[PDB]
């Protein structure tokens, strides 16, 4: 049977302070463990 999920997807679709803290957490955790 005919698929339209892609047709619906293309039909339907028509730096921040939050992100920096996630990067800080990432850096902190990686720095603690690595040799």
């Amino acid at each position: 049977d005919i698929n339209i999920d892609d047709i619906l997807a293309e039909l339907d679709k028509e730096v921040s302070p939050q992100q920096d803290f996630s990067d800080l957490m990432k850096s902190w955790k990686n720095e603690r463990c690595s040799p």
């Binding site: 049977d1 005919i2 698929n3 339209i4 619906l8 039909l11 339907d12």
Partner: protein
């Protein structure tokens, strides 16, 4: 056989205990406890910021109660004694005792910001201002329930000799207006089950012989009621008497059946609280007694959905042990399109007459229209895949935006229906002309 009794919105019996809930609504709830020959009353709020929870002692044994965000009204059905309490201290409380004929009793009471209302078993209606000044007396069918939201008031009436009926009115300070007066009500009665089943829930039917579990206005003033069949009903098009109609918008039993994996967990009961837009506020009660107890359990939230499904068909479609049953995409899309349509119409009527409260509800209406076309496109594509050009073309008329019609053209191309591509483009050209006009 039937007999008249008092009521208040979503109270509980005493049961085996010395305490009970008198009433509940979105703002709060009221409870009381018996202390030998006296009673203690407690008032609770969900807006803890806005209000203070408080308590006081009653010597008279009130059995009626009504709440709003201005104050609380209390009554005694046999003695005719009543009391109104503002939430503020500044306006001191006041009391009165109302005349009653032999064996007559008060069945319900309600209040607006400036109006006070009392009803009785013998069908007498009496009304007073916020300082007890009498305004008028009227003789009607016996009243069984009352509710109000600002100046809009909704009433229910019942008689052996006149059937079941309802009224809708607006107590405008500019003028008082009636929209319906004791017109017939299509509600599902519980009497057959009470007479035959002998289920040991008889105490609830003694406590509520009408079996009307609760009633309230929506978050946008629509009249709503919850039936003894555990179904939610809403009155649409009330502004237009030749178009006004009752709509069944949610069946609780069907939800629990799916939630249980298609099983009969009759040990579970739903206690409604209030309607917030598209979502029911309710308590999920478990065990012998079909109503909640103290300390108050936390509420739940549940969305409305249209009654379209069938148990046997869904069992066949379905065929870890409690997993909720899987549904055909056709049913899901159909139900969504119906639900989107009804929601959009009700919201449109609200905006047309009363406007926006907050400044963004039009965006929700736009989202509903998008969901509506999206659901129709899935159903349309199914019809095209079945090669039913007649049904597919009939469905295409119901799509709104040319974006969706363009998608329908692509869908028709995938279905290899150039006749339908042609006729859709004829429709698109016709609707483009209508848009140019």
């Amino acid at each position: 056989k039937f007999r008249y009794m008092p009521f208040s919105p979503a109270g509980t019996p005493f049961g085996f205990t010395d305490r009970r809930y008198l009433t509940m609504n979105e703002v709060g709830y009221v409870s009381t406890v018996k202390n030998s020959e006296q009673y203690s009353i407690t008032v609770s709020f969900f807006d803890v910021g806005r209000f203070r929870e408080y308590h006081f002692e009653d010597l008279f044994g009130y059995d009626l109660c009504f709440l709003n965000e201005k104050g609380t009204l209390f009554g005694q059905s046999k003695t005719g004694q009543i009391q109104y309490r503002p939430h503020d201290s500044i306006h001191s409380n006041w009391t009165k005792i109302i005349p009653l004929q032999a064996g007559e009793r008060i069945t319900s009471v309600a209040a607006t910001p400036v109006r006070v209302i009392v009803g009785t078993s013998l069908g007498y209606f009496r009304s007073f201002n916020q300082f007890g000044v009498p305004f008028a007396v009227e003789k009607t069918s016996p009243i069984v329930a009352l509710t109000a939201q600002n100046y809009r008031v909704f009433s229910v009436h019942y008689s052996q000799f006149h059937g079941l009926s309802y009224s809708l009115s607006e107590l405008g300070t500019s003028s008082k207006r009636y929209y319906k007066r004791e017109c017939p009500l299509p509600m599902s009665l519980p009497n057959i089950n009470s007479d035959m089943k002998k289920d040991a829930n008889l105490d609830y039917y003694n406590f509520n012989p009408m079996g009307i579990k609760s009633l309230f206005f929506s978050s946008y003033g629509d009249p709503c009621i919850f039936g003894s069949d555990n179904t939610l009903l809403l009155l649409s098009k009330w502004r237009s008497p030749e178009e006004s109609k009752w709509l069944p918008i949610l069946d609780s039993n069907m939800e629990i059946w799916k939630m249980s994996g298609g099983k009969e967990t009759t040990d579970i009961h739903v206690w409604p609280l209030a309607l917030a837009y598209d979502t029911l506020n309710c308590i999920l009660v478990k065990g012998k007694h079909i109503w909640p107890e103290f300390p108050l359990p936390l509420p739940s939230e549940m969305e409305i959905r249209m009654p379209v499904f069938v148990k046997s068909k869904l069992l066949e479609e379905n065929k870890e042990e409690d997993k909720e049953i899987q549904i055909p995409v056709s049913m899901a899309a159909e139900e969504e399109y119906l639900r989107s349509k009804v929601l959009s119409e009700l919201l449109t009527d609200t905006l047309e007459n009363d406007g926006e409260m907050y400044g963004n509800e039009n965006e929700v209406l736009a989202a509903l229209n998008g969901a509506y076309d999206k659901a129709l496109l899935r159903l349309f594509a199914s019809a095209c895949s079945d090669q039913n050009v007649e049904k597919a073309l009939s469905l295409a008329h119901e799509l709104k935006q040319d974006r969706a019609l363009t998608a329908a053209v692509k869908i028709s191309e995938r279905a290899e229906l150039p006749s339908l591509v042609k006729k859709i483009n004829n429709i698109r050209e016709a609707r483009y002309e209508q848009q140019l006009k």
